[PDB]
A paper describes a structure:
Amongst them is a family of proteases sharing a conserved domain, the ovarian tumor domain (OTU) containing a cysteine protease motif. Otubain-1 and Otubain-2 were the first two OTU proteins found to display in vitro DUB activity. Interestingly, OTUB2 has recently been described to fine-tune DNA damage-dependent ubiquitination and thereby influence the choice of DNA repair pathways. OTUB2 is comprised of a 6-stranded β-sheet sandwiched by two helical domains.
A protein complex of human OTUB2 and Ub, an active site directed probe, was obtained by the irreversible formation of the covalent thioether bond between the catalytic site cysteine 51 of OTUB2 and the ethane bromoethyl moiety at the C-terminus of Ub. Protein complexes purified to homogeneity yielded crystals which diffracted to a resolution of 2.05 Å. The overall structure of the OTUB2-Ub complex shows an Ub binding mode similar to other DUBs in that the Ub C-terminal tail is extended and reaches to the catalytic centre. The covalent thioether bond formed between Ub-Gly75-bromo ethyl and OTUB2 Cys51, and the catalytic residues Cys51, His224, Asn226 and Thr45 are all well defined in the electron density map and within sufficient proximity to engage in a hydrogen bonding network. A comparison of the OTUB2 apo and Ub ligand bound structures illustrates only subtle movements of these residues within the catalytic centre. However, large conformational changes and local re-structuring occur at both sides of the Ub binding cleft of OTUB2 upon Ub binding. The main contact regions within the enzyme-ligand interface are formed by the C-terminal tail of Ub inserting into the cleft of OTUB2. Residues 73–75 of Ub are anchored at the bottom of the binding cleft, forming a 2-stranded antiparallel β-sheet with the α9α10 loop (residues 174–176) of OTUB2. In particular, Leu8 of Ub nests in a deep hydrophobic pocket formed by residues Phe153, Phe149, Phe150, Ile178, Thr181 and His177 of OTUB2. The shorter N-terminal tail of OTUB2 is unstructured and oriented away from proximal ubiquitin.
Author numbering:
A (entry chain A): 2 to 232
B (entry chain B): -6 to 75
Write the structure that this text describes.
């Protein structure tokens, strides 16, 4: 079983990504600015699942060695089947995905390492199963609160159709709704750094607002990579 | 000089549950509204998507174009597709 980094990459110093923008002064500037607050980066595969894979890996990675936080998160993960049922998902259809996620949580709990966590998230089948579970849990969160979220859907699209076509299927890109829904579904405090090609100041968004994030993501060229904050 | 009584307030709701109140004119464009949201919330206009009764609001149009009246409520989501 050869070591792979095709889905979640090895961690490099942050200024490594200057190499991705050799001739854009704006990107270079923004990346230099990022380096004041962030020391390193991990890339995720550009397959449409980047947000879900990134959030899952980085949040689990942030749990390593934290027995108390791990236990409290495990208790929450145990209640998620009830969430899925309430939204009309069927146990026999969500079983393998919930199983994959609970298994990786247990791996972290039983004194896991970064190295073993990476092995799971770089295993195509187990990694995709974790993503699919996160997708379903996101869909369930929205469906169970359809009266709130329906106001935020455009082209006069039904909530249920939205979840069916733009949350549940693998490789469908996330957006604000999905992001804040998953964050809330699992209580994962997340910060997104927004980096575009406009000659502007940097900005970020925190979910939920004014929480101390456990996960930092870099949003750039419609893609999500993982950032590591300085001490 | 005759008074203009068209100035009104509209509301903008966000995914955090917060309601923003805006000072607008029926002839304001959606960009103008987005600019006003930026002044209040610090969200760049380019990152804003505005929705009224399930219909996305296009930049060059006006509030009156969408029959948005006094005390109407709009919905705001960020553009974070990745």
């Amino acid at each position: 079983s050869e070591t792979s980094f095709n889905l979640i990459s090895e961690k490099c110093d942050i200024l490594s990504i200057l190499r991705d923008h050799p001739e854009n002064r704006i990107y270079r500037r923004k990346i230099e600015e990022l380096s004041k607050r962030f020391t390193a980066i991990r890339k995720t595969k550009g397959d449409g699942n980047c947000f879900y894979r990134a959030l899952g890996y980085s949040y689990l990675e942030s749990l390593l060695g934290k027995s108390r936080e791990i236990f409290k998160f495990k208790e929450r993960v145990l209640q998620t089947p009830n969430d899925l049922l309430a939204a009309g998902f069927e146990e026999h259809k969500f079983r393998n995905f919930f199983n994959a996620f609970y298994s990786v949580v247990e791996l972290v709990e039983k004194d896991g390492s970064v190295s073993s966590l990476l092995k799971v998230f770089n295993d195509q089948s187990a990694s995709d199963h974790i993503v699919q579970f996160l997708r379903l849990l996101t869909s369930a969160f929205i469906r169970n609160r359809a009266d709130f979220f329906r106001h935020f859907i455009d082209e006069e699209m039904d909530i249920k159709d939205f979840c069916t076509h733009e949350v549940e299927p693998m490789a469908t890109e996330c957006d604000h709704i999905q992001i804040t829904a998953l964050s809330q579904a699992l209580s994962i405090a997340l910060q997104v750094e927004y980096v575009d090609e406009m000659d502007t100041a940097l900005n970020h968004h925190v979910f939920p607002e004014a929480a101390t994030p456990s996960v930092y993501l870099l949003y750039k060229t419609s893609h999500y990579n993982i950032l590591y904050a300085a001490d | 000089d005759v008074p203009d009584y068209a100035h009104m307030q509209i509301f903008v709701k966000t995914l955090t549950g917060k309601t923003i109140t805006l000072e607008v004119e029926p002839s304001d464009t959606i960009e103008n509204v987005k600019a006003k949201i930026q002044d209040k919330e610090g969200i760049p206009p380019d990152q804003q998507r505005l929705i009224f009764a399930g219909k996305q609001l296009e930049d060059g149009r006006t509030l009156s174009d969408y029959n948005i009246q006094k005390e109407s409520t709009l919905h705001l989501v960020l553009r974070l597709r990745g």
